[PDB]
């Protein structure tokens, strides 16, 4: 039942992610506190994270963001039909290599040309402010904004994105998988439901499915490059300690 599988994945997405594209669009219109310079960064910190260099404080907020998202993605994955029937070690492998591809795809839903929603929708940090930071911190988000602006031009909705994220997670290509064949069959079913869904939901764009296959490849390269920046920071920055869960994810990634 392909329509059932799609509905179940979409409901799991709506249940487990605090932010989605509809919610983000409602906020990003007709009020989040705007962080556009050092004064407003310090103001936002006193109101939103009341508990060090500005770039390093932002770095810690960004880690806290990602840790929560990894938790949401793990719950989402456990609700993907068939995922919990996989070898537990393969589930770990799929999440390890999949979470950041999923994170950067879903970041697009909270990004526009001027900045991004942060802190559970209560803040908006500008793209120009991020570029203004000292190296290497100013080099982290720009490729993600670039990816997002092209991704958002596909005009996907949450029903599309939920299937796309499920496809990212259920990927038989990952290094170290024990049960490659079973995961491949899982992925084939999810990709088949994604293909059918895009044809139904986007009859105007007959190449949308191969465009999204290419975005999956682009996301893999984006994550590889991001991990290289993680390593630059961990070994050259005095005060930027990695959260242990994110350290586990990046360890022996690429």
């Amino acid at each position: 039942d392909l329509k059932s599988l799609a509905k179940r994945i979409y409901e799991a997405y709506l249940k487990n992610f605090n932010m989605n594209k509809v919610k983000a669009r409602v906020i990003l219109s007709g009020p989040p506190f705007v962080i556009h310079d050092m004064e407003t960064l310090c103001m936002a910190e006193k109101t939103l994270v009341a508990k060090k260099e500005a770039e390093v404080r932002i770095f810690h907020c960004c880690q806290c963001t990602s840790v929560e998202t990894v938790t949401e993605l793990t719950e989402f994955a456990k609700a993907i039909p068939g995922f919990a029937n996989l070898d537990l070690n393969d589930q770990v492998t799929l999440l390890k290599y999949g979470v950041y591809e999923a994170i950067f795809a879903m970041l697009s839903s909270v990004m526009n040309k001027d900045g991004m929603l942060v802190a559970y929708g209560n803040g908006f940090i500008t793209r120009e402010f991020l570029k203004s930071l000292r190296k290497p911190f100013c080099d982290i988000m720009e490729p993600k904004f670039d990816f997002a602006m092209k991704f958002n031009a596909l005009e996907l909705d949450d029903s599309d994105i939920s299937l796309f994220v499920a496809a990212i997670i259920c990927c038989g290509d990952r290094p170290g998988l024990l049960n490659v064949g079973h995961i491949e069959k899982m992925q084939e079913g999810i990709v088949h439901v994604l293909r059918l869904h895009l044809q139904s939901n986007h009859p105007d764009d007959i190449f949308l499915f191969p465009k999204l296959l290419q975005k999956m490849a682009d996301l893999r390269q984006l994550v590889t490059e991001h991990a290289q920046l993680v390593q630059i920071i961990k070994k050259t920055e005095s005060d930027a300690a990695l959260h242990p869960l994110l350290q586990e994810i990046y360890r022996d990634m690429y």
Partner: peptide
């Protein structure tokens, strides 16, 4: 067991 494995087992 890893932190990730702990998340999956919860």
């Amino acid at each position: 067991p890893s932190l990730l494995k702990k998340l999956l087992l919860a």
